[PDB]
């Protein structure tokens, strides 16, 4: 039972998309003003903004919005407060709402940078929501907001002091931040607020969860000769737990927990949540969308244009020709449209499918198909978060047209470890268990997983029980993308650890009888680890398709069989050693929780005893002396199951898993076939 | 907190009592009870822990409490305190506070759970197990040969 | 009506498993300790093992993960009060 | 085995949204003509 | 098989905007405020601000659209409307159509009015349409097994 | 529907009233309970049944 | 208690929006004491009422 404090660093973003002003268009800039070279030379200042609020009148005090009827100076006016009035979001009521006389608004200053409205934040600075920076004068904080009266430009035509005011903009200063978005089109290298900078665009950063691994893997040192645990009789001064570097405990516990129970449900005590992946992200069932109908927006008020008209009552002709006239019952200038109302148009479904297909696949393509950005500094370290965040990936690669109408997975995406993702439901659940922030005090319980004392029934006495724990930050944790974690600085500190245990209130004499009975020699304890295997790892240098392994002469009493698979070196720490400095990947180790994907990357294997006698023996298999796993298209007669594989390898696997195969195949029963089986995880394409 | 468990706020004792009284699991190390013993109205099918963090109000030096009326985000693209036509102008938003990144804030953490749709149980056994349709203590002599008051 | 000429490709996925080959003489599982495991040929003499693998090429360094399957058992005895003793056996690839 | 007649009042509504001109923009009115007082008379 | 129409959840209008965010525009010019000595108030033109600035007033240009409803209709249509019995359809205008009432060309180039089935057909009632019952519901692209076998 | 914004007070047709709008009423279903719970008396001394 | 009162009391959208308690699987404190079965999403009530 452990208590401690965790900090997840700066690189932790648990949600897709951003949070601030997310509805605003991804190229629309906020109200602002910048400087232009005078055209010494008195540089001028240009303003881009608008004034939504409607008031009463303008004088040198400001804009008046109130009327205190019972004021001491008769009907004294009430001017808007310059610290929070007018509210940025207050607007008009009705779609028509004909224009008022005067108006006001809010506008930034030329000092602060310019950022698009999409992803813009600035902390408030007074009880009423003011964002104006504060400055210390005379030891007291004061504001700096300052009006900026304004007026028609028709000024340019006749009349004089008749110049009256018609739009007060209030202008101030913020401490703008953009916590979770970044620039996706910056036109100029320099940063001085240009005219063109009013068209910069920003997009959010890929979501990235970080949490504790499944079953708290890595938290306790197993199989490490340097730091072996101990459980021994106190007075004995002699050990009772032994270990080698090959007994691979954690995978064995994974498999055992698979066997004696279900997995698709989660238990909070031990973080039991195996890491899945959506079956449609890995394999694409792309068949377009249903869009026989067109969609169509419309004019907020219904009809867009118009055309005044005039009533003409039918003052009919006299005798012959029909004349006309005008009427005074109606108005004189009427709004009327003609024809279909003006309308825009959008294709709905294909847009949603395209958005999803880009966002959930394209961003994870292998790095060698992306191109650096322009005018943004990007880290020179190819593992950190920034590098993965800021590269640019062409959307033309994947879109509605790719492999249309076929069930397939891209060859680029076959070798990408697909459990490193953000729809991996187990990871989402675990990361939400701790919370969404970055500073987290936590309180957990860790099991004991060494089989040889996992179930042992102890008997009265005094024992010494002691064990070691890891302080590394990429072993005890796990990301969603695969970036390093020592670089970004996420730390973890263990304060208190206490041990709990439970007993049975067994009756006295019954327990005494059982104890005496169980101390006898002939009824001792037998235990057997689930996996019961060795572990051998052999290197495979890049771009090689041949691996020989030789084992010198020895006896083979009571063998069981071979299991094998393939692994990426970048995703596997070294064994035994208490800390692997050359390890720079915080994704999901397959070697320690059973997540393999390379199984399709094999061709065949061959075995021999004493270098001359093959062992399928006696010409059993269709091929002479080799298990022909998969054939290329040249295998004109041996591909089976409408796919790549050969019959005989299929037969061998089906036998060794289900004892099916000598009497025609079929679907084995449910309870006999579990999550990590063969047939549950087979897909031809 | 020295006693809470399962990343929640529920004392170990109550968890032990519930697990024993429902499925007699709890003296051999906990684990997920099997399916058929766990029906709709059960306990373990209706138990959910949750936790979050919020912004502390005494350490973030620039904390400024903000009412609802003066809160603006997505301004100039949504209504004002109602579902009607959009109003206002664009501006940086004032307050959903930040909790991630290089600019975090001092925060505290809260934890709770939800266990609707079941009854809290306590068995009248000597060691909280389901050993028979009639419990043992109900046969204990002292409870079947006299009277007692309950509080 | 205007479909171009085409060729066909096929391939399979075997996510999240292991590849197995058990040491029977008929590739079945008729009990844990397999029959060939106790035959006189492979239990009262020496032998040397040679395995050859053919794979599909990649670009980054990799590891071949081989799992020899043997027995691992432990017997635990405890005669007196507060004294516990054990013994392990891991048949071939022993200690 | 019972038989009867049931009336769920006027506050019975089993669908979200409506069925009458669902697409039409919310603000827009339909064709109409109203009256005003000319003060120049 | 069974039309289970609940309406759609739409209590908020969904609006679209101008690619730039601000609506129309109108040139404007800065002014200052030389005191109005002994009298009202002057109002000159300062020289610090370039005298052609962009500004809108009031709200900004915006268009409305009903997302959920629109999607539902697309759906009902594409999935129930087309498979209606042949007799409820009329030939298209000024385009050729094969007279053989079986081949693909006829099966396609006919047209069925989206007015028959709408966002309000039997609204609120779990029910199935008369013309559809005696028409095979296994001949339908929403099929799972047929899709799987076609893609394999 | 019910009017979600009414600029004026008198409902008389006016120029402003071209801006009123609407909003659909919330749905509420009504039916017979599960297993007809309550349709049959029980557990009450007032109206005990008889076999 | 009647329908119209539940139909015409309006509540600000801002109280809940896509920037609420982000990232955290969590329930609103005001909603831990409101009967989660008097709720229109309910499948059983819907089926019974349609029937
Ligand atoms: Ca103009
Ligand atoms: Ca102008």
PDB file of N, CA and C in Angstrom, chain A residues 242 277 282 414 519 524-525 527-528 532 534-536 538 540 543 547 549-551 554 558 560-565 567 569 596 601 603-604 606 608 610 649 653 662 675 681 683 685, chain C residues 11-13 15-16 19-21 23 26 28 37 46-54 56 58 60-70 72 74 76-77 80 82 88 92-93:
ATOM      1  N   UNK A 242      14.372 -17.721  -4.686  1.00  0.00           N
ATOM      2  CA  UNK A 242      15.464 -17.754  -5.645  1.00  0.00           C
ATOM      3  C   UNK A 242      14.927 -17.312  -6.996  1.00  0.00           C
ATOM      4  N   UNK A 277      -7.759  -1.926 -28.943  1.00  0.00           N
ATOM      5  CA  UNK A 277      -7.720  -0.931 -30.002  1.00  0.00           C
ATOM      6  C   UNK A 277      -8.940  -1.154 -30.870  1.00  0.00           C
ATOM      7  N   UNK A 282      -7.645  -0.134 -37.076  1.00  0.00           N
ATOM      8  CA  UNK A 282      -6.612  -0.993 -37.645  1.00  0.00           C
ATOM      9  C   UNK A 282      -7.003  -1.495 -39.025  1.00  0.00           C
ATOM     10  N   UNK A 414       1.218  -1.417 -41.003  1.00  0.00           N
ATOM     11  CA  UNK A 414       1.259  -2.760 -40.433  1.00  0.00           C
ATOM     12  C   UNK A 414       2.225  -2.842 -39.262  1.00  0.00           C
ATOM     13  N   UNK A 519       2.487 -29.528   9.445  1.00  0.00           N
ATOM     14  CA  UNK A 519       3.929 -29.459   9.623  1.00  0.00           C
ATOM     15  C   UNK A 519       4.633 -30.746   9.239  1.00  0.00           C
ATOM     16  N   UNK A 524       3.725 -31.739   1.972  1.00  0.00           N
ATOM     17  CA  UNK A 524       4.284 -30.413   1.775  1.00  0.00           C
ATOM     18  C   UNK A 524       3.584 -29.687   0.632  1.00  0.00           C
ATOM     19  N   UNK A 525       4.153 -28.550   0.238  1.00  0.00           N
ATOM     20  CA  UNK A 525       3.537 -27.682  -0.755  1.00  0.00           C
ATOM     21  C   UNK A 525       4.220 -27.825  -2.109  1.00  0.00           C
ATOM     22  N   UNK A 527       4.258 -26.165  -6.072  1.00  0.00           N
ATOM     23  CA  UNK A 527       3.815 -25.013  -6.836  1.00  0.00           C
ATOM     24  C   UNK A 527       4.439 -25.007  -8.216  1.00  0.00           C
ATOM     25  N   UNK A 528       3.684 -24.453  -9.162  1.00  0.00           N
ATOM     26  CA  UNK A 528       4.019 -24.518 -10.578  1.00  0.00           C
ATOM     27  C   UNK A 528       3.594 -23.228 -11.258  1.00  0.00           C
ATOM     28  N   UNK A 532       5.889 -21.408 -17.309  1.00  0.00           N
ATOM     29  CA  UNK A 532       6.832 -22.519 -17.284  1.00  0.00           C
ATOM     30  C   UNK A 532       7.612 -22.606 -18.592  1.00  0.00           C
ATOM     31  N   UNK A 534      11.480 -21.062 -20.681  1.00  0.00           N
ATOM     32  CA  UNK A 534      12.734 -20.329 -20.669  1.00  0.00           C
ATOM     33  C   UNK A 534      12.521 -18.985 -21.359  1.00  0.00           C
ATOM     34  N   UNK A 535      13.604 -18.269 -21.645  1.00  0.00           N
ATOM     35  CA  UNK A 535      13.508 -17.041 -22.426  1.00  0.00           C
ATOM     36  C   UNK A 535      14.813 -16.823 -23.163  1.00  0.00           C
ATOM     37  N   UNK A 536      14.762 -16.814 -24.488  1.00  0.00           N
ATOM     38  CA  UNK A 536      15.943 -16.502 -25.272  1.00  0.00           C
ATOM     39  C   UNK A 536      15.620 -15.383 -26.247  1.00  0.00           C
ATOM     40  N   UNK A 538      17.369 -13.126 -29.417  1.00  0.00           N
ATOM     41  CA  UNK A 538      18.526 -13.060 -30.290  1.00  0.00           C
ATOM     42  C   UNK A 538      18.476 -11.823 -31.175  1.00  0.00           C
ATOM     43  N   UNK A 540      18.725  -9.225 -34.322  1.00  0.00           N
ATOM     44  CA  UNK A 540      18.420  -9.271 -35.745  1.00  0.00           C
ATOM     45  C   UNK A 540      18.833  -7.938 -36.350  1.00  0.00           C
ATOM     46  N   UNK A 543      17.520  -5.230 -42.038  1.00  0.00           N
ATOM     47  CA  UNK A 543      17.496  -5.713 -43.418  1.00  0.00           C
ATOM     48  C   UNK A 543      18.229  -7.045 -43.565  1.00  0.00           C
ATOM     49  N   UNK A 547      18.049 -16.112 -39.702  1.00  0.00           N
ATOM     50  CA  UNK A 547      18.575 -16.160 -38.341  1.00  0.00           C
ATOM     51  C   UNK A 547      18.877 -17.599 -37.953  1.00  0.00           C
ATOM     52  N   UNK A 549      20.280 -20.301 -35.110  1.00  0.00           N
ATOM     53  CA  UNK A 549      20.576 -20.473 -33.697  1.00  0.00           C
ATOM     54  C   UNK A 549      20.965 -21.919 -33.447  1.00  0.00           C
ATOM     55  N   UNK A 550      22.032 -22.106 -32.685  1.00  0.00           N
ATOM     56  CA  UNK A 550      22.538 -23.427 -32.374  1.00  0.00           C
ATOM     57  C   UNK A 550      22.649 -23.571 -30.869  1.00  0.00           C
ATOM     58  N   UNK A 551      22.267 -24.738 -30.369  1.00  0.00           N
ATOM     59  CA  UNK A 551      22.362 -25.080 -28.958  1.00  0.00           C
ATOM     60  C   UNK A 551      23.255 -26.305 -28.848  1.00  0.00           C
ATOM     61  N   UNK A 554      23.164 -31.518 -25.386  1.00  0.00           N
ATOM     62  CA  UNK A 554      22.577 -31.626 -24.056  1.00  0.00           C
ATOM     63  C   UNK A 554      21.355 -32.530 -24.124  1.00  0.00           C
ATOM     64  N   UNK A 558      11.724 -34.387 -20.800  1.00  0.00           N
ATOM     65  CA  UNK A 558      10.427 -33.814 -20.435  1.00  0.00           C
ATOM     66  C   UNK A 558      10.199 -32.438 -21.050  1.00  0.00           C
ATOM     67  N   UNK A 560       8.444 -29.658 -23.595  1.00  0.00           N
ATOM     68  CA  UNK A 560       7.053 -29.419 -23.956  1.00  0.00           C
ATOM     69  C   UNK A 560       6.880 -28.850 -25.355  1.00  0.00           C
ATOM     70  N   UNK A 561       7.606 -27.797 -25.707  1.00  0.00           N
ATOM     71  CA  UNK A 561       7.467 -27.238 -27.035  1.00  0.00           C
ATOM     72  C   UNK A 561       8.040 -25.842 -27.131  1.00  0.00           C
ATOM     73  N   UNK A 562       8.020 -25.331 -28.357  1.00  0.00           N
ATOM     74  CA  UNK A 562       8.510 -24.003 -28.675  1.00  0.00           C
ATOM     75  C   UNK A 562       7.352 -23.040 -28.851  1.00  0.00           C
ATOM     76  N   UNK A 563       7.541 -21.827 -28.368  1.00  0.00           N
ATOM     77  CA  UNK A 563       6.709 -20.698 -28.733  1.00  0.00           C
ATOM     78  C   UNK A 563       7.632 -19.618 -29.264  1.00  0.00           C
ATOM     79  N   UNK A 564       7.176 -18.844 -30.238  1.00  0.00           N
ATOM     80  CA  UNK A 564       8.049 -17.760 -30.653  1.00  0.00           C
ATOM     81  C   UNK A 564       7.255 -16.600 -31.223  1.00  0.00           C
ATOM     82  N   UNK A 565       7.956 -15.468 -31.308  1.00  0.00           N
ATOM     83  CA  UNK A 565       7.451 -14.238 -31.905  1.00  0.00           C
ATOM     84  C   UNK A 565       8.637 -13.319 -32.200  1.00  0.00           C
ATOM     85  N   UNK A 567      10.174  -9.006 -32.143  1.00  0.00           N
ATOM     86  CA  UNK A 567      10.094  -7.785 -31.354  1.00  0.00           C
ATOM     87  C   UNK A 567      10.953  -6.684 -31.965  1.00  0.00           C
ATOM     88  N   UNK A 569      13.626  -3.717 -31.320  1.00  0.00           N
ATOM     89  CA  UNK A 569      14.649  -3.445 -30.316  1.00  0.00           C
ATOM     90  C   UNK A 569      14.387  -2.132 -29.601  1.00  0.00           C
ATOM     91  N   UNK A 596       1.631  -8.283 -29.208  1.00  0.00           N
ATOM     92  CA  UNK A 596       2.479  -8.579 -30.349  1.00  0.00           C
ATOM     93  C   UNK A 596       1.746  -8.252 -31.642  1.00  0.00           C
ATOM     94  N   UNK A 601       5.077 -11.243 -40.049  1.00  0.00           N
ATOM     95  CA  UNK A 601       6.317 -10.920 -40.730  1.00  0.00           C
ATOM     96  C   UNK A 601       7.239 -12.120 -40.887  1.00  0.00           C
ATOM     97  N   UNK A 603       8.401 -16.050 -42.524  1.00  0.00           N
ATOM     98  CA  UNK A 603       8.356 -16.905 -43.701  1.00  0.00           C
ATOM     99  C   UNK A 603       8.323 -18.380 -43.329  1.00  0.00           C
ATOM    100  N   UNK A 604       9.311 -18.867 -42.585  1.00  0.00           N
ATOM    101  CA  UNK A 604       9.343 -20.290 -42.264  1.00  0.00           C
ATOM    102  C   UNK A 604      10.457 -20.570 -41.267  1.00  0.00           C
ATOM    103  N   UNK A 606      12.977 -24.087 -39.631  1.00  0.00           N
ATOM    104  CA  UNK A 606      13.414 -25.462 -39.794  1.00  0.00           C
ATOM    105  C   UNK A 606      14.228 -25.896 -38.587  1.00  0.00           C
ATOM    106  N   UNK A 608      16.460 -29.216 -36.460  1.00  0.00           N
ATOM    107  CA  UNK A 608      17.265 -30.411 -36.663  1.00  0.00           C
ATOM    108  C   UNK A 608      17.944 -30.822 -35.364  1.00  0.00           C
ATOM    109  N   UNK A 610      21.181 -32.904 -34.154  1.00  0.00           N
ATOM    110  CA  UNK A 610      22.483 -33.365 -34.641  1.00  0.00           C
ATOM    111  C   UNK A 610      22.650 -33.134 -36.140  1.00  0.00           C
ATOM    112  N   UNK A 649       0.432 -25.345 -42.029  1.00  0.00           N
ATOM    113  CA  UNK A 649       0.656 -24.520 -40.852  1.00  0.00           C
ATOM    114  C   UNK A 649      -0.653 -24.239 -40.136  1.00  0.00           C
ATOM    115  N   UNK A 653      -1.345 -25.239 -36.168  1.00  0.00           N
ATOM    116  CA  UNK A 653      -1.812 -24.304 -35.156  1.00  0.00           C
ATOM    117  C   UNK A 653      -3.150 -24.738 -34.579  1.00  0.00           C
ATOM    118  N   UNK A 662      -8.273 -33.243 -37.274  1.00  0.00           N
ATOM    119  CA  UNK A 662      -8.283 -34.543 -37.925  1.00  0.00           C
ATOM    120  C   UNK A 662      -9.660 -34.953 -38.399  1.00  0.00           C
ATOM    121  N   UNK A 675      -9.103 -14.738 -24.916  1.00  0.00           N
ATOM    122  CA  UNK A 675      -8.699 -13.513 -25.596  1.00  0.00           C
ATOM    123  C   UNK A 675      -7.390 -13.689 -26.353  1.00  0.00           C
ATOM    124  N   UNK A 681      -8.145 -14.047 -32.875  1.00  0.00           N
ATOM    125  CA  UNK A 681      -7.295 -12.970 -33.363  1.00  0.00           C
ATOM    126  C   UNK A 681      -6.727 -13.301 -34.732  1.00  0.00           C
ATOM    127  N   UNK A 683      -7.286 -12.614 -38.928  1.00  0.00           N
ATOM    128  CA  UNK A 683      -8.012 -11.818 -39.908  1.00  0.00           C
ATOM    129  C   UNK A 683      -7.410 -11.962 -41.296  1.00  0.00           C
ATOM    130  N   UNK A 685      -7.363 -10.797 -45.286  1.00  0.00           N
ATOM    131  CA  UNK A 685      -7.701  -9.593 -46.019  1.00  0.00           C
ATOM    132  C   UNK A 685      -7.192  -9.730 -47.439  1.00  0.00           C
TER     133      UNK A 685
ATOM    134  N   UNK C  11      -3.308 -10.933 -47.728  1.00  0.00           N
ATOM    135  CA  UNK C  11      -2.449 -10.987 -46.548  1.00  0.00           C
ATOM    136  C   UNK C  11      -3.324 -11.018 -45.299  1.00  0.00           C
ATOM    137  N   UNK C  12      -2.731 -11.452 -44.185  1.00  0.00           N
ATOM    138  CA  UNK C  12      -3.491 -11.703 -42.968  1.00  0.00           C
ATOM    139  C   UNK C  12      -2.834 -11.037 -41.771  1.00  0.00           C
ATOM    140  N   UNK C  13      -3.639 -10.849 -40.732  1.00  0.00           N
ATOM    141  CA  UNK C  13      -3.217 -10.260 -39.472  1.00  0.00           C
ATOM    142  C   UNK C  13      -3.463 -11.235 -38.333  1.00  0.00           C
ATOM    143  N   UNK C  15      -2.754 -10.391 -34.782  1.00  0.00           N
ATOM    144  CA  UNK C  15      -2.432  -9.569 -33.625  1.00  0.00           C
ATOM    145  C   UNK C  15      -2.559 -10.352 -32.326  1.00  0.00           C
ATOM    146  N   UNK C  16      -1.662 -10.055 -31.386  1.00  0.00           N
ATOM    147  CA  UNK C  16      -1.844 -10.419 -29.983  1.00  0.00           C
ATOM    148  C   UNK C  16      -1.980 -11.930 -29.796  1.00  0.00           C
ATOM    149  N   UNK C  19       3.156 -17.836 -31.579  1.00  0.00           N
ATOM    150  CA  UNK C  19       3.126 -18.995 -32.457  1.00  0.00           C
ATOM    151  C   UNK C  19       3.629 -20.198 -31.673  1.00  0.00           C
ATOM    152  N   UNK C  20       2.903 -21.314 -31.756  1.00  0.00           N
ATOM    153  CA  UNK C  20       3.185 -22.501 -30.961  1.00  0.00           C
ATOM    154  C   UNK C  20       3.580 -23.678 -31.840  1.00  0.00           C
ATOM    155  N   UNK C  21       4.484 -24.507 -31.332  1.00  0.00           N
ATOM    156  CA  UNK C  21       4.766 -25.830 -31.879  1.00  0.00           C
ATOM    157  C   UNK C  21       5.054 -26.755 -30.699  1.00  0.00           C
ATOM    158  N   UNK C  23       5.718 -30.426 -28.575  1.00  0.00           N
ATOM    159  CA  UNK C  23       6.655 -31.530 -28.796  1.00  0.00           C
ATOM    160  C   UNK C  23       5.980 -32.891 -28.729  1.00  0.00           C
ATOM    161  N   UNK C  26       2.329 -36.383 -32.743  1.00  0.00           N
ATOM    162  CA  UNK C  26       1.173 -36.173 -33.597  1.00  0.00           C
ATOM    163  C   UNK C  26       0.624 -34.762 -33.480  1.00  0.00           C
ATOM    164  N   UNK C  28      -0.611 -33.156 -31.147  1.00  0.00           N
ATOM    165  CA  UNK C  28      -1.731 -32.962 -30.240  1.00  0.00           C
ATOM    166  C   UNK C  28      -1.229 -32.680 -28.831  1.00  0.00           C
ATOM    167  N   UNK C  37       8.465 -36.523 -24.538  1.00  0.00           N
ATOM    168  CA  UNK C  37       9.323 -35.988 -23.503  1.00  0.00           C
ATOM    169  C   UNK C  37       9.947 -37.037 -22.618  1.00  0.00           C
ATOM    170  N   UNK C  46      22.473 -37.543 -25.105  1.00  0.00           N
ATOM    171  CA  UNK C  46      22.723 -36.147 -25.420  1.00  0.00           C
ATOM    172  C   UNK C  46      22.279 -35.833 -26.841  1.00  0.00           C
ATOM    173  N   UNK C  47      22.023 -34.552 -27.090  1.00  0.00           N
ATOM    174  CA  UNK C  47      21.587 -34.123 -28.409  1.00  0.00           C
ATOM    175  C   UNK C  47      21.899 -32.650 -28.599  1.00  0.00           C
ATOM    176  N   UNK C  48      22.081 -32.261 -29.855  1.00  0.00           N
ATOM    177  CA  UNK C  48      22.433 -30.900 -30.220  1.00  0.00           C
ATOM    178  C   UNK C  48      21.367 -30.337 -31.140  1.00  0.00           C
ATOM    179  N   UNK C  49      21.041 -29.065 -30.954  1.00  0.00           N
ATOM    180  CA  UNK C  49      19.863 -28.475 -31.573  1.00  0.00           C
ATOM    181  C   UNK C  49      20.256 -27.411 -32.585  1.00  0.00           C
ATOM    182  N   UNK C  50      19.619 -27.427 -33.754  1.00  0.00           N
ATOM    183  CA  UNK C  50      19.874 -26.423 -34.782  1.00  0.00           C
ATOM    184  C   UNK C  50      18.558 -25.898 -35.329  1.00  0.00           C
ATOM    185  N   UNK C  51      18.347 -24.589 -35.227  1.00  0.00           N
ATOM    186  CA  UNK C  51      17.148 -23.950 -35.742  1.00  0.00           C
ATOM    187  C   UNK C  51      17.534 -22.873 -36.745  1.00  0.00           C
ATOM    188  N   UNK C  52      16.774 -22.791 -37.833  1.00  0.00           N
ATOM    189  CA  UNK C  52      17.006 -21.814 -38.886  1.00  0.00           C
ATOM    190  C   UNK C  52      15.715 -21.075 -39.179  1.00  0.00           C
ATOM    191  N   UNK C  53      15.773 -19.747 -39.185  1.00  0.00           N
ATOM    192  CA  UNK C  53      14.601 -18.905 -39.366  1.00  0.00           C
ATOM    193  C   UNK C  53      14.712 -18.091 -40.644  1.00  0.00           C
ATOM    194  N   UNK C  54      13.607 -17.996 -41.376  1.00  0.00           N
ATOM    195  CA  UNK C  54      13.501 -17.119 -42.532  1.00  0.00           C
ATOM    196  C   UNK C  54      12.326 -16.185 -42.307  1.00  0.00           C
ATOM    197  N   UNK C  56      10.706 -11.766 -42.826  1.00  0.00           N
ATOM    198  CA  UNK C  56      10.515 -10.676 -43.770  1.00  0.00           C
ATOM    199  C   UNK C  56      11.337  -9.462 -43.356  1.00  0.00           C
ATOM    200  N   UNK C  58      13.036  -5.817 -42.521  1.00  0.00           N
ATOM    201  CA  UNK C  58      12.564  -4.581 -41.914  1.00  0.00           C
ATOM    202  C   UNK C  58      13.696  -3.565 -41.995  1.00  0.00           C
ATOM    203  N   UNK C  60      14.582  -1.400 -38.866  1.00  0.00           N
ATOM    204  CA  UNK C  60      15.214  -1.101 -37.593  1.00  0.00           C
ATOM    205  C   UNK C  60      15.660  -2.384 -36.904  1.00  0.00           C
ATOM    206  N   UNK C  61      16.642  -2.313 -36.011  1.00  0.00           N
ATOM    207  CA  UNK C  61      17.129  -3.534 -35.364  1.00  0.00           C
ATOM    208  C   UNK C  61      16.010  -4.215 -34.599  1.00  0.00           C
ATOM    209  N   UNK C  62      16.018  -5.545 -34.598  1.00  0.00           N
ATOM    210  CA  UNK C  62      14.913  -6.278 -34.003  1.00  0.00           C
ATOM    211  C   UNK C  62      15.450  -7.413 -33.145  1.00  0.00           C
ATOM    212  N   UNK C  63      14.539  -8.098 -32.464  1.00  0.00           N
ATOM    213  CA  UNK C  63      14.870  -9.242 -31.632  1.00  0.00           C
ATOM    214  C   UNK C  63      13.961 -10.406 -31.979  1.00  0.00           C
ATOM    215  N   UNK C  64      14.533 -11.599 -31.989  1.00  0.00           N
ATOM    216  CA  UNK C  64      13.778 -12.830 -32.135  1.00  0.00           C
ATOM    217  C   UNK C  64      13.535 -13.388 -30.745  1.00  0.00           C
ATOM    218  N   UNK C  65      12.264 -13.592 -30.401  1.00  0.00           N
ATOM    219  CA  UNK C  65      11.847 -13.986 -29.063  1.00  0.00           C
ATOM    220  C   UNK C  65      11.494 -15.458 -29.113  1.00  0.00           C
ATOM    221  N   UNK C  66      12.372 -16.296 -28.568  1.00  0.00           N
ATOM    222  CA  UNK C  66      12.204 -17.741 -28.578  1.00  0.00           C
ATOM    223  C   UNK C  66      11.884 -18.183 -27.163  1.00  0.00           C
ATOM    224  N   UNK C  67      10.901 -19.063 -27.042  1.00  0.00           N
ATOM    225  CA  UNK C  67      10.407 -19.568 -25.776  1.00  0.00           C
ATOM    226  C   UNK C  67      10.543 -21.079 -25.804  1.00  0.00           C
ATOM    227  N   UNK C  68      11.563 -21.593 -25.131  1.00  0.00           N
ATOM    228  CA  UNK C  68      11.629 -23.011 -24.837  1.00  0.00           C
ATOM    229  C   UNK C  68      10.715 -23.296 -23.654  1.00  0.00           C
ATOM    230  N   UNK C  69       9.893 -24.338 -23.760  1.00  0.00           N
ATOM    231  CA  UNK C  69       8.941 -24.680 -22.715  1.00  0.00           C
ATOM    232  C   UNK C  69       9.465 -25.868 -21.920  1.00  0.00           C
ATOM    233  N   UNK C  70       9.598 -25.691 -20.610  1.00  0.00           N
ATOM    234  CA  UNK C  70      10.049 -26.752 -19.720  1.00  0.00           C
ATOM    235  C   UNK C  70       9.170 -26.745 -18.485  1.00  0.00           C
ATOM    236  N   UNK C  72       8.746 -26.044 -14.382  1.00  0.00           N
ATOM    237  CA  UNK C  72       9.270 -25.274 -13.263  1.00  0.00           C
ATOM    238  C   UNK C  72       8.389 -25.583 -12.065  1.00  0.00           C
ATOM    239  N   UNK C  74       8.282 -26.192  -7.546  1.00  0.00           N
ATOM    240  CA  UNK C  74       8.925 -25.890  -6.274  1.00  0.00           C
ATOM    241  C   UNK C  74       8.225 -26.657  -5.170  1.00  0.00           C
ATOM    242  N   UNK C  76       7.882 -26.865  -1.030  1.00  0.00           N
ATOM    243  CA  UNK C  76       8.052 -26.020   0.142  1.00  0.00           C
ATOM    244  C   UNK C  76       7.716 -26.826   1.384  1.00  0.00           C
ATOM    245  N   UNK C  77       8.654 -26.858   2.333  1.00  0.00           N
ATOM    246  CA  UNK C  77       8.552 -27.619   3.569  1.00  0.00           C
ATOM    247  C   UNK C  77       8.817 -26.681   4.732  1.00  0.00           C
ATOM    248  N   UNK C  80       9.354 -26.651  11.750  1.00  0.00           N
ATOM    249  CA  UNK C  80       9.197 -26.073  13.075  1.00  0.00           C
ATOM    250  C   UNK C  80       8.512 -24.717  12.995  1.00  0.00           C
ATOM    251  N   UNK C  82       8.184 -20.970  12.592  1.00  0.00           N
ATOM    252  CA  UNK C  82       8.921 -19.861  12.015  1.00  0.00           C
ATOM    253  C   UNK C  82      10.218 -20.254  11.348  1.00  0.00           C
ATOM    254  N   UNK C  88      13.753 -25.910  -5.564  1.00  0.00           N
ATOM    255  CA  UNK C  88      13.227 -25.690  -6.902  1.00  0.00           C
ATOM    256  C   UNK C  88      13.766 -26.739  -7.858  1.00  0.00           C
ATOM    257  N   UNK C  92      15.036 -29.270 -18.300  1.00  0.00           N
ATOM    258  CA  UNK C  92      16.269 -28.809 -18.960  1.00  0.00           C
ATOM    259  C   UNK C  92      16.387 -27.308 -19.140  1.00  0.00           C
ATOM    260  N   UNK C  93      17.628 -26.815 -19.163  1.00  0.00           N
ATOM    261  CA  UNK C  93      17.983 -25.476 -18.708  1.00  0.00           C
ATOM    262  C   UNK C  93      17.780 -25.407 -17.206  1.00  0.00           C
TER     263      UNK C  93
END
